[PDB]
Amino acid sequence: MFKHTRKLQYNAKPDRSDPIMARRLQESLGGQWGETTGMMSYLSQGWASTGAEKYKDLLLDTGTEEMAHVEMISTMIGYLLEDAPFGPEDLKRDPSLATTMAGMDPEHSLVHGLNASLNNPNGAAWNAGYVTSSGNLVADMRFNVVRESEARLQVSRLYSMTEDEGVRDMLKFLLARETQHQLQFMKAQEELEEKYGIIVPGDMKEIEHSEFSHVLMNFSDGDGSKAFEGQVAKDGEKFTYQENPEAMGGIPHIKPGDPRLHNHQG
Amino acid sequence: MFKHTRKLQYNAKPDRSDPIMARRLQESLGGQWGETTGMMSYLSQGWASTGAEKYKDLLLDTGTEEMAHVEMISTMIGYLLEDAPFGPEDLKRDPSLATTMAGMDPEHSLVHGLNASLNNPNGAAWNAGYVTSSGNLVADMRFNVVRESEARLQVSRLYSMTEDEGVRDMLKFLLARETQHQLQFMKAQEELEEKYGIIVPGDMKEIEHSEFSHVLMNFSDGDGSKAFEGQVAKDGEKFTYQENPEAMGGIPHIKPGDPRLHNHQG
Amino acid sequence: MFKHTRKLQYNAKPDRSDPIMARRLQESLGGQWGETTGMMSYLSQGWASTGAEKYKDLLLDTGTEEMAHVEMISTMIGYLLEDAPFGPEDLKRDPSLATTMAGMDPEHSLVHGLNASLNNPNGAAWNAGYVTSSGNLVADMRFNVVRESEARLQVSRLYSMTEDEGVRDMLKFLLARETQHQLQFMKAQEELEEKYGIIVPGDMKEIEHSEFSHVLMNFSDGDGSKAFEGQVAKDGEKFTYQENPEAMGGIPHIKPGDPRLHNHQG
Amino acid sequence: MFKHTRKLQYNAKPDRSDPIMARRLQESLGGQWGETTGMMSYLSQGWASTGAEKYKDLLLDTGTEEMAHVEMISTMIGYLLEDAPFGPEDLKRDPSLATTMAGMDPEHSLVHGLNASLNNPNGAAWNAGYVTSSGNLVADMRFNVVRESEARLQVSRLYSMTEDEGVRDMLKFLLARETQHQLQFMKAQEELEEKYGIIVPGDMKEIEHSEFSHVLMNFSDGDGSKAFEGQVAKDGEKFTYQENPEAMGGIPHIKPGDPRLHNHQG
Amino acid sequence: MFKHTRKLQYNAKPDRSDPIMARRLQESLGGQWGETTGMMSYLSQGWASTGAEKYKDLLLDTGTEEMAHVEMISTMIGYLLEDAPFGPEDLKRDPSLATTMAGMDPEHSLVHGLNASLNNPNGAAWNAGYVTSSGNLVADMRFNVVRESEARLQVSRLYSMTEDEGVRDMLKFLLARETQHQLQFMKAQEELEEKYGIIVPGDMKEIEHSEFSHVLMNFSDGDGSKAFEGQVAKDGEKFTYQENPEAMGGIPHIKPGDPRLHNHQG
Amino acid sequence: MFKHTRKLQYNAKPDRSDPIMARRLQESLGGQWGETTGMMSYLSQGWASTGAEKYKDLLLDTGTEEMAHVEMISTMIGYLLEDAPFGPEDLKRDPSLATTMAGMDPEHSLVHGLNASLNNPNGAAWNAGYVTSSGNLVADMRFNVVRESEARLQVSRLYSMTEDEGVRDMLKFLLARETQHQLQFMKAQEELEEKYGIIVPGDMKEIEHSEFSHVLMNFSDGDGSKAFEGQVAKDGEKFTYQENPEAMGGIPHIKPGDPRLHNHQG
Ligand SMILES: [Ca+2]
Ligand SMILES: [Ca+2]
Ligand SMILES: [Ca+2]
Ligand SMILES: [Ca+2]
Ligand SMILES: [Ca+2]
Ligand SMILES: [Ca+2]
Ligand SMILES: [Mn+3]
Ligand SMILES: [Mn+3]
Ligand SMILES: [Mn+3]
Ligand SMILES: [Mn+3]
Ligand SMILES: [Mn+3]
Ligand SMILES: [Mn+3]
Ligand SMILES: [Mn+3]
Ligand SMILES: [Mn+3]
Ligand SMILES: [Mn+3]
Ligand SMILES: [Mn+3]
Ligand SMILES: [Mn+3]
Ligand SMILES: [Mn+3]
Ligand SMILES: [O-]
Ligand SMILES: [O-]
Ligand SMILES: [O-]
Ligand SMILES: [O-]
Ligand SMILES: [O-]
Ligand SMILES: [O-]
Ligand SMILES: [O-]
Ligand SMILES: [O-]
Ligand SMILES: [O-]
Ligand SMILES: [O-]
Ligand SMILES: [O-]
Ligand SMILES: [O-]
Ligand SMILES: [O-]
Ligand SMILES: [O-]
Ligand SMILES: [O-]
Ligand SMILES: [O-]
Ligand SMILES: [O-]
Ligand SMILES: [O-]
């Protein structure tokens, strides 16, 4: 179960309003790699785990922390939309506001009354297709590292899209929390690989066709990938290289369907 | 530009038909972590790169290979649907087929004439929300490792959902190529991390609030995560632990909106 | 069965063109709470009803009227897009059109030839996930009241986003029809609540855990909700208040999955 | 900010496993009117409010409670999927499992390792298009009443779809919480309506075309809606009835587009 | 404006209930090429037309007709769901219904009270991404012919998925209307091609690079398309054939982006 | 299987950057009727065909060509985004860039590092709901003609949305390839109609209710469509016309559902 305090985890107040920045920050709230994706993925994985408490608790700690980041971004967006222009009266007040209006999300005013949405900057709704929880923590720890990496890259870009010290203060905190999240998930990942294997899942080595398991196949005519030839892979074996990959499966000959289907194909 | 040969990369013909397995394999064709997601992500990333040829070509080689995997899975699905039941005639010939029909995707017969769709097993259309190409290859190589990890996990599970030796032969080839892909991407990732830093992006360490960058925060009441306290993180610094994270940002108080919005909130 | 007349229900011509207003009005056509949502929801509910003709006919009457509103908004959008700027040649005649072009939906010209789409202002397609028809009219009449309330609020907001008297004339008519629809739906709601009960569905009181049915649980640390304590609910019973809600379900321990799943969780 | 305890709010363990019921319960977790829609709507509205603490705190109390319900449902799905059949070895052990297997979501095993997804029973991803937060609490409290009414209707149906006492125990608690949530939201609604008006928004009465505000228009030829004629609406004015609604807006003719659009329409 | 009559355009009552057929028929209501797609596309195009009344009226006639088909299919689904099984009590009456239950859409009972949804058989919501209205009727008439062709193909398939004479009677009516719709749209299509040209749009012949306009390029290694060489196209010119298409565009080299983006690509 | 060459099929380099045109070109990449739709539709149909090699090979040839067009568009967008403004430093250097920035897709910079997305200009993700492969090539060849028609119309419009000769050079090539694709698909369609019939599917004529197959029904009150009366349809029979379509199916009366559903409808 959860409990809430009205106090934010860290400052989320800008020095000045900026409805364009509000739109950009929707990425961190409702976007593919944003805080809702983290919260929902880590909590889902945390609830699904039946294994080591060390990782299960780490996931519940972090998914709960991400709810605090969702709260911060939502709040920051609301502050950034204060006094945003949305009608002729604003333009009569100041005609330069037409370009600001042109760059805003029309729904921030019309649908949400100058409050945050749960969409990305282009109005695309956040959706559970962005969430991963597979039951396998070697795979999902790798996902959690990527989640924090794409997120931290976006936060770093956002840092250069504003000169507001209040906004940057919040971003500086999130950058740091994302550094910690990348590190802790890499540690868990490393511990899990040591236990189960560097290849996911680590118990299928005997089953796969080993003959194709370490060959770089050159399907494009560039020469760059040839530099991997002869390098030792993480599992201790070297890569070989095939300049001209061959088709080994033959030409398919699927049986025509039942006439009740009317599959008229010539 | 691309060129095509009708010959498959590797065998994709089952020993017998199985429309239930056909529906499961739709995961690998139109699902979140399936081969289409691979093909579109790697090609997009490769086209976007202005960097070292070694990684750009690796992406284009692999994206092109995943197109061959898409073709194989589509082909396998078509074979698996040969003679599938879809109407009263079929139940007339064999009433047991009713439980088979109940587990099939009704659109396989009705919309596609017993051929593959580009949806997952539940009819959800594949979509670009599953693709990642961010411009930063340290982050995107981590994504690519995850893409092949989740995929190989699913293929490993598919292997246990059939006893068809023809189906398994194809799966054993995919497992091996996914091993190679996981390895090559891990290699690329390690080289980029060496060049740019283990935290993504690597050039923001002076900007983040350092004080919070290595603190594990205990938001859930289990003690499992305390085990990380004092461990050395991949960047050479130790993790500290905070048993009681504090709310540091205060209580928000945003300004009420203009009356033209009619934000009646008591 | 339906029949159509080319004449519109009410005026839908603006005094002047305005492609920015055309984009906003997309919300009333293809948005979450727009006219298509009302049309599809009320017709579905009316077709589903096997009950009192009073409500079934009210639903078909209103659903049919909303089709007229869809027609009117589609028409208004077309008039508002007359002579809209979309390329260099327009800028040459009037270079002040650059900001207008920047705030337009690029698809209005490119995809639709300066005609309405069935998307919202951000290009998000209208979809059936916005529709509700549950088989229970006590619940669905509450939904219908909400549909008209959110719609009338957006129309009220649109009223302040233009000074065009022709646009406003149409909005004034819509406001009035939405007043009527809110009222007719509240009347039907009221009657049904009187027949079946105020809690939906009204025949489960003996089944629920009554001990928890009138307790306000304080999950967030603000004190505002305490004001409800001791007030009389709509069912005649008073609210009680719990300042410190308790976790009564214990800690879950679900069984680890079959090894064939490769759920490696440490 | 939020904190979490591993203890569930209320019991969420079934007496026996049942993967078909697990699939139905996905409706309460990832469905249109499910607990996720509840959690996200109330928290969004709560963070958005700048109004009375009485309602802001209520929204945050309830949004936070709904996160516990999400946690319970996810856990219950987990228990219900224990030992679920997913491959040929299971059918060899017990042939009768084939129909169970046919009615399951194939992704529960293949993608999630026999854990919950954030999809509905048909694999459709939960998405933010289900959420409402408009800035107007008279409208949004009406939405909140509907959200709890549709949810409680669904939980009531689920009660008749199982005979498991452990499952029913959880449903009996949810029923009771949905009773309190419907009531408290109705209470808040009534207070807001007294302050602002029964029509949303309450301040447009002098703007709308009053002549059409209380007329029931008969667009379908059934006779049932005439029963409203002469009844007093909630605002104290009687409904009038129009048996033959008139088209007052004429026939629109919009101007053909510029030749550069190639709008060839004969 | 529209008017409704409770009478259906044609019979839509099955001889017996069949909830599996109900689910299949969801394709005709909420699917990609179903009647809602026809209805919204033809009405959108008809409202957009500024051209000849012959086509504009045809579109409005047919779009209106399609609403009658939507109503018929919704009604049919309702009848087919009469007495459908959804709980243990049903299995107590007739254990053989377990398979029927496994094949049903779980939401028909749970969400809709055994009534139609606006989704396809797999629960995917109908959406406006299925609709086309471009402003060019040479293009859109071709789309309309396709719409009716895919629909009639699906109806033909449904015909073989039931032996219920009542259901087939309805299907026989739809096949005929779809024959008429295909013919009328092909006739309008032919007339518009005569006026504007067979290539869409017809006024760009002098602009395109004519050298590549009649060349069949052989990108896959089969010899089948060589049969087109020397055949005469519908514009009177013969197809030529290139066995080895050449890459004429060079190797792209885009400029590395600004460091503020952190595009670390090695 | 596929192979790739770094060389583009044709020139894809603009003379100058233009982030607004970049946004418009996303329609051709990730939009409903764009090159991705073509690629996936033709490959899917090609893989599904079990009929004549002439058509199967044609589909695979063209599907493979469309991948080159995807590559060209992705490349052209990357060049058009070179040096695009995204933050305050840009505006400090040149304040006139504000209107450009206002019209851009915010995700081009923030998510993709000034590279292409797989979304349309409005950020709506490309999805498989755009693709058709039905198993019947008479219907699907009609689809393919439409796909190239809508695409070519959009390309023709883009031509008028820029004065850049480099961009225009690319569009001139696409226009020609789309002329060829329209023609080749119309040729195949014609051959298939000649073999199977002009109505799709061609083998259901004795089943449909013939009485209704050639009747134009006047559902909207315009007189335009009467002009089709007596004209000869493509199947050699004349159209009749019905000025007042009659409702022949009566008034539906479906049975009230089981009480366990709580369908309270009055
Ligand atoms: Ca290569
Ligand atoms: Ca903890
Ligand atoms: Ca409180
Ligand atoms: Ca009526
Ligand atoms: Ca060929
Ligand atoms: Ca007419
Ligand atoms: Mn975070
Ligand atoms: Mn984080
Ligand atoms: Mn692969
Ligand atoms: Mn791979
Ligand atoms: Mn209306
Ligand atoms: Mn209304
Ligand atoms: Mn709840
Ligand atoms: Mn609740
Ligand atoms: Mn029809
Ligand atoms: Mn039709
Ligand atoms: Mn092309
Ligand atoms: Mn083409
Ligand atoms: O995060
Ligand atoms: O974060
Ligand atoms: O974070
Ligand atoms: O693969
Ligand atoms: O692969
Ligand atoms: O792969
Ligand atoms: O309205
Ligand atoms: O309305
Ligand atoms: O409305
Ligand atoms: O609940
Ligand atoms: O609840
Ligand atoms: O709830
Ligand atoms: O039809
Ligand atoms: O039709
Ligand atoms: O149709
Ligand atoms: O093209
Ligand atoms: O093309
Ligand atoms: O194309």
CATH code where residue B230 lies: 3.30.1530.10
Alpha carbon B118 to its chain centroid, in Å, reads 15
For residues B163 and C191, give the distance between their C-alpha atoms in angstroms, rounded to a whole number. Answer: 60
| Catalytic option among A107, A112, A150, A178 | A178
Query: Resolution limit in angstroms?
Result: 1.8
Residues A246, A256, single domain; the answer is: yes
B181 labelled binding-site residue: yes
Q: Give CA torsion, residues B187, B188, B193, B195, to 10 deg.
A: 120
Last residue of a domain, one of C203, C226, C242: C203
Q: Are residues F167 and F211 in the same domain?
A: no
R_g of chain C computed on alpha carbons: 25
| Dist. CA F172–CA F151, nearest whole Å | 13
Q: Which amino acid is at A64?
A: T
Beta bridge partners of B220: D4
Please indicate whether residue B178 is annotated as part of the active site.
yes
Please answer whether residues F113 and B91 qualify as being in contact, where contact means their C-beta atoms are separated by less than 8 angstroms. no
Under 8 Å between Cβ of A225 and B54: yes
Provide the residues around ligand 8 (an ion) whose CB is within 5 A. A 181
Contact F86 E254 (CB under 8 A): no
Alpha-carbon radius of gyration of chain B = 25
Which CATH number is D65's domain given? 1.20.1260.10
Would you mind telling me the total number of residues written for chain B in this entry?
266
Q: Which ligand is nearest to the CA of F68?
A: 17
Is residue E212 located within the same domain as residue E196?
A: no
Query: Which of D47, D55, D204 shows the shortest CA–CA distance to D131?
Result: D47
Is D74 annotated as belonging to a binding site? no
Is residue D230 classed exposed, middle or buried when 0-12, 13-18 and 19+ CB atoms within 10 A define those classes? exposed
Query: E3 Cβ partners below 8 Å, 6+ apart?
Result: C2, C3, C4, C5, C64, D219, D220, D221
- The reply to whether residue E129 touches residue F134, judged by beta carbons under 8 angstroms, is no
CA distances from C193 to D146, D188, E93 (A): 13, 18, 33
Structural tokens at position A63: 């998914």
Indicate whether F122 and F241 sit together in one domain: no
Whether B28 contacts B171, CB under 8 Å: no
**What radius of gyration, in Å, describes the C-alpha atoms of chain A?**
25
D24·E110 Cβ contact <8 A: yes
The verdict on D225 and D97 lying in the same domain is no
Catalytic residue selected from A4, A69, A165, A209: A69
Task: Tell me if E73 sits within 8 A of E35, measured CB to CB.
Answer: yes
Using DSSP bridges, classify how beta strands C2-4 and E2-4 pair: parallel, antiparallel or unpaired: antiparallel
F252 vs E contacts (CB less than 8 Å): 6, 8, 12-13, 75, 78-79
Nearest residue to B112 (alpha-carbon basis) of B88, B89, B80: B80
Check if F263 contacts D (Cβ < 8 Å).
Answer: no
* D8, D47, D115 member nearest A48 (Cβ): D115
Same domain, yes or no: A5 and A123: yes
Phi and psi, residue F68, nearest 5°: -65, -35
DSSP label at D119?
B
Find, in chain E, the residue whose alpha carbon is nearest to that of D20: E102
So which residues of F are the catalytic ones?
35, 66, 69, 148, 178, 181
**Do E210 and E224 belong to one domain?**
yes
Residue F95: cis peptide before it, omega within 30 degrees of 0: no
H or E segment to which residue A114 belongs: none
Binary contact (F135, B117; C-beta < 8 A): no
Size of interface C-F (CB pairs under 8 A): 114
Q: Is D148 a catalytic residue?
A: yes
- C27 and C42, same domain (yes or no): yes
> CB of D109 within 8 Å of any CB in chain B?
yes
Chain D segment 186-245 residues within 8 A of E by beta carbon are 219-222, 245
Q: What subunits make at least 3 CB pairs under 8 angstroms with B?
A: A, C, D, E, F
Whether residue F221 sits in one domain with residue F154: no
CB B263 within 8 A of CB A109: no
Burial class (CB in 10 A: 0-12, 13-18, 19+), A130: buried
The last residue of a domain, from among E172, E203, E234: E203
Distance CA A69, CA A30 (A): 12
- Residues of D with Cβ-Cβ distance to A9 under 8 angstroms: 1
Interface contact F221-C5, CB threshold 8 A: yes
* Number of helices (H), then strands (E), in chain E: 8, 3
What is the torsional sign of CA C155, C160, C161, C166? positive
- Per-window interface: D 115-154 vs E, CB < 8 A: 120-124, 154
Number of domains chain A is built from:
2
Residue reference for tokens 């409990």: A3
Q: Which tokens is B55 given?
A: 């990684």
Write out the binding residues of A for Mn(2+): 35, 66, 69, 148, 181
- E201 CA distance to ligand 28 middle (Å): 56
* Residues spanned by the domain of D234: 204-266
Domain-terminating residue out of A203, A233, A256: A203
DSSP per position, C154-222: HHHHHHTT---HHHHHHHHHHHHHHHHHHHHHHHHHHHHHHHH-SSSSTT-TTTS-GGGTTEEE--BS-
Q: Which residue has the CA at smallest separation from atom 1 of ligand 31?
A: E174
| CA dist., res. D227 & res. C186, Å (int) | 15
**Residue F35 marked in a binding site:** yes
Q: What are phi and psi of C55, to 5 degrees?
A: -80, -40
Q: Is C154 in the same domain as C219?
A: no
Contact B138, B200 (CB under 8 A): yes
Burial A101-114 (b: 16+ CB within 10 A, else e): bbbbbbbbbbbbbb
CB count in 10 Å sphere of residue D95: 9
Instruction: Say whether D4 counts as a known binding-site residue.
Output: no
Contact status, residue C134 vs residue E111, Cβ threshold 8 Å: yes
Distance D174 CA to ligand 28 centre (A): 4
One-letter amino acid identity for B237? E
Residues E56 and E8 in one domain: yes
Phi and psi for E240 in degrees, rounded to 5? -105, 175
Would you tell me how many other CB atoms lie within 10 Å of the CB of residue D259?
A: 10
Residue with CA nearest ligand 20 atom 1: A174
Question: Environment class of residue E194 by beta-carbon count within 10 Å: exposed (0-12), middle (13-18) or buried (19+)?
Answer: exposed
Do B141 and B253 belong to one domain? no
B148 is catalytic: yes
Q: Is the peptide bond before E259 cis (omega within 30 degrees of 0)?
A: no
